[PDB]
Amino acid sequence: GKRVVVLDPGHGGIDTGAIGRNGSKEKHVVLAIAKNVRSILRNHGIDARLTRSGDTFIPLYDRVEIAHKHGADLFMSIHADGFTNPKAAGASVFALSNRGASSAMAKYLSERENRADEVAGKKATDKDHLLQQVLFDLVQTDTIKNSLTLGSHILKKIKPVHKLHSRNTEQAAFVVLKSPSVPSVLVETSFITNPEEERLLGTAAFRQKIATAIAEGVISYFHWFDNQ
Ligand SMILES: [Zn+2]
């Protein structure tokens, strides 16, 4: 009865994700961080798997399908996305809300992240949107509660290491958080659009520090869960 954790490095292939002022691509940065997290979790006896181990495009639903196929106890998307103002900064963790965004920045990023599927030509029909809302509405309460707890465990560990954009786990209607049963969060490691954070994201030490904080968060979460 080993724990399975599925890590989704956001973007990939033709989807660069956000690009920093000095040209860094989210997709490369988050693959590096995701791999680091995997290693640490496996060193501690958790069966951690990637939705992609190379530079590949994956549709948002397929990322969640991979979590389901592997029987995940936990699913985590890792990003480093953008805002239109270079001054937005700090790390975030998000869980689902089907009712409405908890913050303006949650609402902004859920839209930006959810439109990643468009890079492949596939603009979302109304019928697609209806199916999303229905599916978000079906997510269990315990799932969302557990994702919020996971989220506060991760923020607790990031906080001593790097600026938080928000002290709480925020919520919005992220497609990759649509699993009814698997606790799911999306982690923003920084804003790549902030020049200082782009620079940090460009360093092995920072990527390692951030990945360490994320893995400690997961581990801390499993500890809490087992004590209940
Ligand atoms: Zn992203």
Residue numbers in the entry: 55 to 282
Q: What does the primary publication say about this deposited structure?
A:
All the three division-associated amidases have overlapping enzymatic functions in hydrolyzing the peptidoglycan amide bond between the sugar and the first amino acid of the peptide cross-link. In their resting states, zinc-dependent peptidoglycan amidases such as AmiB and AmiC adopt autoinhibited conformations in which their active sites are blocked by an alpha helix containing a conserved glutamate residue which binds to the active-site zinc. The activators share a common motif, the LytM domain, which forms the proposed site of amidase binding and activation.
Crystals of AmiA diffract to a resolution of 2.4 Å and contain two molecules per asymmetric unit. Each AmiA monomer consists of a single globular domain with a six-membered beta sheet and six alpha helices. As demonstrated in subsequent sections, the blocking helix has a role in autoinhibiting the activity of AmiA and forms part of a larger regulatory domain (residues 151–194) which includes a second alpha helix that constitutes the binding site for EnvC. The interaction helix is also notable for possessing five solvent-facing hydrophobic residues (Leu184, Leu185, Val188, Leu189, Leu192) and is the only feature for which we identify meaningful conformational differences between the two AmiA molecules observed in the crystal structure. In one chain, the interaction helix is well defined, while in the other, the corresponding electron density is smeared out, consistent with thermal motion. We further assessed the dynamics of AmiA by plotting the B-factors from each monomer against sequence and performing molecular dynamics simulations. Both the experimental data and simulations consistently show that the regulatory domain is much more dynamic than the rest of the protein. The overall structure of AmiA is consistent with an autoinhibited form of the enzyme in which the active-site zinc is occluded by the blocking helix, while a potential protein interaction site remains exposed to solvent ready for activation.
